[PDB]
Design an enzyme around this catalytic site. Structure first.
Site, PDB file in Angstrom:
ATOM      1  N   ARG A   1       0.814  -1.211   0.000  1.00 34.68           N
ATOM      2  CA  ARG A   1       0.000   0.000   0.000  1.00 34.68           C
ATOM      3  C   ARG A   1       0.848   1.261   0.000  1.00 34.68           C
ATOM      4  O   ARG A   1       0.466   2.261  -0.613  1.00 34.68           O
ATOM      5  CB  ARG A   1      -0.935   0.014   1.206  1.00 34.68           C
ATOM      6  CG  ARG A   1      -2.164  -0.867   1.082  1.00 34.68           C
ATOM      7  CD  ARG A   1      -2.887  -0.933   2.420  1.00 34.68           C
ATOM      8  NE  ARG A   1      -4.060  -1.801   2.417  1.00 34.68           N
ATOM      9  CZ  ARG A   1      -4.015  -3.126   2.356  1.00 34.68           C
ATOM     10  NH1 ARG A   1      -2.856  -3.752   2.274  1.00 34.68           N
ATOM     11  NH2 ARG A   1      -5.135  -3.828   2.371  1.00 34.68           N
TER      12      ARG A   1
HETATM   13  N1  LIG Z   1      -9.604   1.926  -7.019  1.00 29.54           N
HETATM   14  C1  LIG Z   1      -8.385   1.066  -6.951  1.00 29.54           C
HETATM   15  N2  LIG Z   1      -7.556   0.974  -7.989  1.00 29.54           N
HETATM   16  C2  LIG Z   1      -6.456   0.199  -7.935  1.00 29.54           C
HETATM   17  N3  LIG Z   1      -6.150  -0.495  -6.880  1.00 29.54           N
HETATM   18  C3  LIG Z   1      -6.927  -0.455  -5.807  1.00 29.54           C
HETATM   19  C4  LIG Z   1      -8.118   0.370  -5.831  1.00 29.54           C
HETATM   20  N4  LIG Z   1      -8.700   0.213  -4.617  1.00 29.54           N
HETATM   21  C5  LIG Z   1      -7.935  -0.633  -3.911  1.00 29.54           C
HETATM   22  N5  LIG Z   1      -6.944  -0.976  -4.647  1.00 29.54           N
HETATM   23  C6  LIG Z   1      -5.916  -1.878  -4.203  1.00 29.54           C
HETATM   24  O1  LIG Z   1      -6.477  -2.809  -3.178  1.00 29.54           O
HETATM   25  C7  LIG Z   1      -5.596  -2.586  -1.964  1.00 29.54           C
HETATM   26  C8  LIG Z   1      -6.414  -2.518  -0.753  1.00 29.54           C
HETATM   27  O2  LIG Z   1      -6.864  -1.180  -0.640  1.00 29.54           O
HETATM   28  P1  LIG Z   1      -7.619  -0.701   0.765  1.00 29.54           P
HETATM   29  O3  LIG Z   1      -8.974  -0.059   0.416  1.00 29.54           O
HETATM   30  O4  LIG Z   1      -6.727   0.315   1.495  1.00 29.54           O
HETATM   31  O5  LIG Z   1      -7.855  -2.028   1.716  1.00 29.54           O
HETATM   32  P2  LIG Z   1      -9.060  -2.216   2.796  1.00 29.54           P
HETATM   33  O6  LIG Z   1     -10.067  -3.130   2.201  1.00 29.54           O
HETATM   34  O7  LIG Z   1      -8.513  -2.819   4.097  1.00 29.54           O
HETATM   35  O8  LIG Z   1      -9.683  -0.893   3.086  1.00 29.54           O
HETATM   36  C9  LIG Z   1      -4.934  -1.303  -2.152  1.00 29.54           C
HETATM   37  O9  LIG Z   1      -3.608  -1.352  -1.547  1.00 29.54           O
HETATM   38  C10 LIG Z   1      -4.828  -1.109  -3.586  1.00 29.54           C
HETATM   39  O10 LIG Z   1      -3.561  -1.648  -4.047  1.00 29.54           O
END
Ligand SMILES: Nc1ncnc2c1ncn2[C@@H]1O[C@H](COP(=O)(O)OP(=O)(O)O)[C@@H](O)[C@H]1O
Ligand SMILES: Nc1ncnc2c1ncn2[C@@H]1O[C@H](COP(=O)(O)OP(=O)(O)OP(=O)(O)O)[C@@H](O)[C@H]1O
Ligand SMILES: [Mg+2]
Ligand SMILES: [Mg+2]
Lengths: 470, 15, 39, 187, 487
Positions: free
Chosen positions: E367
């Protein structure tokens, strides 16, 4: 007021015996003799003039017989415009090292939900600039939204894209409550809101108040910080009439913290392992996050789904409290499609032809129909291969894969991952592009021409580039 | 300091 | 040489406190008075 | 209604009943009276005949506490104490009353301000140094306190002494010093 | 030696006696001791049993104290005396631990004598708040091409190593520890990384061989090893991660940079489940207690990156998680995925197919990622990641096969960032698109030897600048083309 003695300490559960002046339930008590302020919230009356309480901080170093003082009122936090641009914890103390929050009034974090005669009915679509959201499950101004998702599927990235778009375009005193999330993410949000000017460290014209109880906090803090942020937003809605945005991330941590303390309160476990009072706790908390005839609260909530279940009592119980659910999927995110929104599991209450119009509604229903047909075909597609499908079936699969790819979109907050620049597709571009893909106007383009684009113009441009270069 | 004058008698014995 | 040294040291330690095994409460009363001074 | 918390807290059904009795007596100033009372009733029960009459689980509770009413009206017992035994037969907690008696004893022995000290030795102690260390022990407590010193003997501690002042504890034994010296010599 | 006994072991021997507060064991069982007394004991205070054991005051109850026994309850009998220590459970911290193997309580188990620590730190401290932290910027170099290129790790991050059994998770952690030797010997004291390896539920022979691998590579001189192995009490396997985390917080708080490996957290969750079920607590999913998430999250939250007002130190955590049959949607894997900042998915299909390290590039993520790369590695790894995504989409194809074979690496062979950049450059500009795949590794080997035996100046310039300039670009171009003509 009343003074009592600690008689038992088990985790975050402290039993306090009072000799006279028993404190009502939900009151705040101050443990005497500690370096930092430790607050206990009364939960039960055990009899024998003993009460059981949940501690808002760590209980280490507590000794049986330690003095405890009664406040006479529940946890009161400072509320007002002076909370904007500040970070406060579960009990209203500033945790941003900028001095006390000198407000004129304090509100108790426990309040009564608005009555039935105060409910508002208006339903106006809130355009977020996201394709799948605005097409298949549009959000509503003043409606509770909720973003369901497993571990690492895009909950926080999606909530931050929504923050960017809506909150930046907004003018109504947003509020962010971090409940049981990463402290790193809280620091990131604080500083990206400082640099964008939404939080003003000087010449205070801020328009967002933060409230944070993160993963490192004991269960009591993680179980009441949502109520604290909720209280800030309720003040901004009622006693100012403002149009508030409220972001809560993550709200499953509230239920989880209740479940962690429930065992120690001596209650028989319900199904799965949660507390018997899961639904009523979620109801008393979630019925206060609502639009009334006095003001408007647009509530976006991230909802963790344990082990990707969606039938776990906490997500299942949360579903009934939302007007527009957006369900992320791990199977979709493993295909590389972001945001990983499940098109066949995200719903909305304004997805009604008399609200979004017959054009939008029919395009959405057709997209979902084609995706459902593709899903039902997938099994024999992967058993026998596509070479055995009907020609009409090959056409439905082609259009379905194209719609799958077009549903993805590069996010401004995800340039670090996608490499592309974030696109903000307005509503009519979404409707028109999907209508055209449905009609068959792109049966010649390769499917990879739709992956991670903005409007359909970019899809045709990407197809041209692929055709010329390759 | 009785146990030091305990110990070094034994230590000299071991010597 | 160093291993023989360590093992001889080990037998010496268990032998010296065997010597105590084979082997007057004035110090007891003195410690009592000291604790009484400790109040 | 307000309750008088004794200076010590005993737990269990014994602790609860004895706390009730103490907070009842403290509001009428009849504590040593009711101690002599429960002393008497404990020696009433410790004789085997009606001890078996009362621990019988095949009596009817009415029968057992009827005999209890009889024998408690015999010895012109205080209403407080008759009521306590009536409640112990009502709730069926009768066989445990010795314990309650037990509790009450302990309770008021910290009402009079006694501190129980226990000196274990490896040798049967001399009389001189016994009261020597009694005088030494006296200086730890505030005035109004009385030492209940009971020195038993265990010849395995290899000398010295092990004195327990309530829960405070000094281990001047020689076996433990030998263990400490061995540990230091090994580490 | 004779007077090594009367040294001071007798003269300075703590032969004092003090008025101590005590309790008496009521009932020992299931690794919990109900103790009567200890009226003034504190919650989570360390008490000491008669047998020299130690325990933590968990349940302060009205009539007794529940004590978690840090060791075998075989050595505890009813009636044993339990003394207070007055100190909430804490462990020795300091630099005197580097090179030492210790157990979860800080006691040396390497036979090299006592740890001369002067400072003690609580195991259950709270993680830093929002203000003390700052975003991850400095790279934490692993020396593995795949990780350092595609899944970069910064200082102050939490990066899960998740995968089935026998897929190379401990190897990745051990190479990350060995790689920091080039920095710990240098001159810049803001690039030194002190490593900590907490071994939980592991075979003790495996930990001994791990300490051997670290001693042969001369990596023990800057490494703490906390060992709570398979035969140790469940409370010790529960405590070990917090002991290691406090030993690392010592460096994080004094402007230095620590790295910590928890190997693994699944076994700590299993030990905590044992303790919770023996405490009759309600079991949730997979019989795990309700607060196993809190268990791991209060721990992985202490791996932070402080700002320059709080010292500027950091603590990087590489928690390890072992999945069953490749199921990542399990309870504890998803818990730790919810806590950390990324993953490194090791696969059994890749590991069995000779692709080692068996990192799944499509599923591994970081991340933070880009914010903690060098410029040169970023230049080449961006194009590498784009081409690898292209290749996995169509699974150009030959370029993808070439790159994935360029990502293979040997054990105990962490490459400097300059040499990784050189190899990835030679791979990503096409200079072996026409070399048939199976010789690539061979080429790679030879190539790098070339670049390290003769062109040390280019590597030194890359090291100094951090980026691969246009001058160095054309220089490396002619180097690789001349070698390929020779090869
Ligand atoms: N809109 C997106 N585009 C590209 N990659 C994404 C997107 N959303 C999430 N990701 C990927 O999925 C991973 C998880 O994102 P995150 O939302 O921070 O996890 P969580 O479900 O715990 O909230 C991110 O590190 C990112 O690499
Ligand atoms: N990068 C590598 N290249 C080649 N072989 C490797 C590599 N890493 C590991 N191996 C081999 O595969 C074995 C896997 O051992 P390793 O400890 O690294 O995996 P693990 O995930 O820790 O499994 P375990 O659960 O048993 O500890 C190693 O002993 C080693 O022989
Ligand atoms: Mg989240
Ligand atoms: Mg391993």
């Amino acid at each position: 007021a009343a003074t009592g003695r600690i008689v038992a300490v088990i985790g975050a559960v402290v039993d306090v015996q009072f000799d006279e002046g028993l404190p009502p339930i939900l009151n705040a008590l101050e443990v005497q003799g500690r370096e930092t302020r430790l607050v206990l919230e009364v939960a039960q009356h055990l009899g024998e003039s003993t009460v059981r309480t949940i501690a808002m901080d760590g209980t280490e170093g507590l000794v049986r017989g330690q003095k405890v003082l009664d406040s006479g009122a529940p946890i009161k936090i400072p509320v007002g415009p002076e909370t904007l641009g500040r970070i406060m914890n579960v009990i209203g103390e500033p945790i941003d090292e900028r001095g006390p929050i000198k407000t004129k009034q304090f509100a108790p974090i426990h309040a009564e939900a608005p009555e039935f005669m105060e409910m508002s009915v208006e339903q106006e679509i809130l355009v977020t600039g996201i394709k799948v959201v605005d097409l298949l499950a549009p959000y509503a101004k003043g409606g509770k939204i909720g973003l369901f998702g497993g571990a690492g599927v895009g909950k926080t990235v999606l909530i931050m894209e929504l923050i960017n778009n809506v909150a930046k375009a907004h003018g109504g005193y947003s509020v962010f409550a971090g409940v049981g999330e990463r402290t790193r993410e809280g620091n990131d949000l604080y500083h990206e809101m400082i640099e964008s000017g939404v939080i003003n460290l000087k010449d205070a014209t801020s328009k967002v108040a933060l409230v944070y109880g993160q993963m490192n906090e004991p269960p009591g803090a993680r179980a009441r910080v949502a109520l604290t942020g909720l209280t800030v937003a309720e003040y901004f809605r009622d006693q100012e009439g403002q149009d508030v945005l409220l972001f809560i991330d993550n709200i499953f941590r509230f239920t989880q913290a209740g479940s962690e303390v429930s065992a120690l309160l001596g209650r028989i476990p319900s199904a799965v392992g949660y507390q018997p009072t899961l639904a009523t706790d979620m109801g008393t908390m979630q019925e206060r996050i609502t639009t009334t005839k006095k003001g408007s609260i647009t509530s976006v909530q991230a909802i963790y789904v344990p082990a990707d279940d969606l039938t776990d009592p906490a997500p299942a119980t949360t579903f009934a409290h939302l007007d527009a659910t957006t369900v992320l999927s791990r199977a979709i995110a493993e295909l590389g499609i972001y945001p990983a929104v499940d098109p066949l599991d995200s719903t909305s209450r304004i997805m009604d032809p008399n609200i979004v119009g017959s054009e939008h509604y029919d395009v959405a229903r057709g997209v979902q129909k084609i995706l459902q047909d593709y899903k039902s075909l997938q099994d024999i597609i992967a058993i026998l291969g596509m070479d055995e499908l009907s020609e009409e079936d090959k056409l439905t699969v082609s259009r379905a894969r194209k719609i799958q790819r077009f549903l993805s979109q590069p996010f401004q907050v995800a340039e670090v991952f996608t490499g592309h620049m974030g696109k903000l597709v307005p509503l009519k571009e979404t409707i028109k592009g999907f209508q055209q893909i449905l009609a068959g106007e792109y049966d010649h383009l390769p499917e990879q021409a739709f992956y991670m684009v903005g409007p359909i113009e970019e899809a045709v441009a990407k197809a041209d580039k692929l055709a010329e270069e390759h | 300091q009785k146990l030091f004058v305990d110990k070094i008698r034994e230590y000299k014995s071991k010597r | 040489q160093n291993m023989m040294r360590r093992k001889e040291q080990e037998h010496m330690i268990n032998w010296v406190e065997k010597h105590v095994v084979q082997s007057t409460i004035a110090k007891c009363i003195a410690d009592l008075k000291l604790l009484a001074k400790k109040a | 209604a307000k309750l008088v918390r004794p200076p010590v807290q005993v737990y269990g059904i014994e602790g609860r009943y004895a706390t009730a009795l103490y907070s009842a007596a403290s509001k009428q100033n009849k504590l040593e009276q009711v101690e002599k009372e429960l002393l008497r009733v404990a020696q009433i029960l410790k004789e085997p005949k009606v001890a078996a009459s009362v621990l019988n689980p095949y009596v009817k509770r009415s029968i057992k506490v009827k005999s209890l009413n009889d024998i408690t009206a015999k010895e012109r017992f205080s209403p407080l104490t008759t009521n306590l035994i009536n409640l112990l037969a009502e709730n069926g907690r009768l066989s445990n009353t010795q314990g309650v008696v037990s509790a009450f004893s302990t309770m008021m022995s910290v009402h009079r301000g006694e501190v129980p000290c226990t000196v274990t030795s490896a040798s049967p102690l001399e009389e001189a140094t016994l009261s020597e260390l009694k005088t030494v022990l006296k200086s730890f407590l505030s005035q109004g306190q009385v030492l209940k010193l009971e020195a038993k003997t265990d010849p395995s501690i290899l000398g010295g002494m092990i004195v327990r002042i309530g829960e405070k504890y000094v281990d001047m034994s020689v076996k433990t010093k030998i263990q400490k010296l061995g540990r230091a010599m090994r580490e | 030696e004779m007077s090594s006994i009367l040294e001071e072991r007798i003269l300075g021997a703590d032969t004092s006696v003090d008025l101590e507060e005590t309790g008496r064991v009521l009932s020992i069982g299931d690794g919990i001791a109900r103790v009567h007394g200890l009226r003034n004991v504190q919650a989570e205070e360390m008490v000491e049993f008669s047998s020299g054991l130690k325990g933590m005051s968990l349940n302060l109850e009205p009539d007794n104290v529940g004590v978690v026994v840090f060791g075998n309850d075989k050595l505890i009998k009813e009636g044993d005396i339990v003394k207070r220590t007055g100190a909430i459970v804490d462990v020795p911290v300091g630099e005197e631990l580097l090179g030492r193997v210790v157990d979860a309580l800080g006691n040396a188990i390497d036979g090299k004598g006592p740890i001369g620590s002067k400072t003690r730190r609580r195991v259950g401290l709270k993680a830093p708040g929002i203000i003390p932290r700052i975003s991850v910027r400095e790279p934490m170099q692993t020396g593995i091409k795949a990780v350092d290129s595609l899944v970069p790790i910064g200082r102050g991050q939490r990066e899960l190593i998740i995968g089935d059994r026998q897929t190379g998770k401990t190897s990745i952690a051990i190479d990350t520890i060995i790689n920091q030797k080039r920095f710990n010997d240098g001159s810049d004291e803001k690039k030194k990384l002190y490593c900590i390896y907490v071994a939980i539920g592991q075979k003790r022979s495996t930990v001994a061989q791990l300490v051997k691998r670290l001693t042969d590579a001369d990596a023990m001189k800057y490494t703490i090893v906390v060992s709570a192995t398979a035969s140790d009490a469940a409370p010790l396997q529960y405590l070990a991660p917090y002991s290691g985390c406090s030993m690392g917080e010592y460096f994080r708080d004094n402007g230095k940079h620590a790295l910590i490996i928890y190997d693994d957290l699944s076994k700590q969750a299993v030990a905590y489940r044992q303790m919770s079920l023996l405490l009759r607590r309600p079991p949730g999913r997979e019989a795990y207690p309700g607060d196993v998430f809190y268990l791991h999250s209060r721990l992985l939250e202490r791996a932070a990156k402080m700002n320059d007002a709080f010292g500027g130190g950091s603590l990087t955590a590489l928690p390890v998680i072992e999945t069953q049959a490749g199921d990542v949607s399990a309870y504890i894997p998803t818990n730790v995925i919810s806590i950390t900042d990324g993953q490194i998915f090791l696969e059994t299909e890749l590991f069995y197919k000779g692709i080692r390290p068996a990192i799944n590039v499509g599923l591994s993520v970081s991340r933070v990622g880009s914010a903690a790369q060098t410029r040169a590695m970023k230049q080449v790894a961006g194009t590498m990641k784009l081409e690898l995504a292209q290749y996995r989409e169509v699974a150009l194809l030959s370029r993808g096969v070439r790159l994935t074979e360029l990502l293979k690496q040997g054990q105990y062979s962490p490459m400097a960032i300059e040499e990784q950049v050189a190899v990835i450059y030679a791979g990503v500009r096409g200079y072996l698109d026409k070399l048939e795949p199976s010789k690539i590794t061979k080429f790679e080997n030879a190539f790098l030897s070339h670049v390290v035996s003769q062109h040390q100046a280019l590597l030194g310039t890359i090291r100094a600048d951090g980026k691969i300039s246009e001058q160095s670009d054309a220089k490396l171009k002619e180097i690789v083309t001349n070698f390929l003509a020779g090869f």
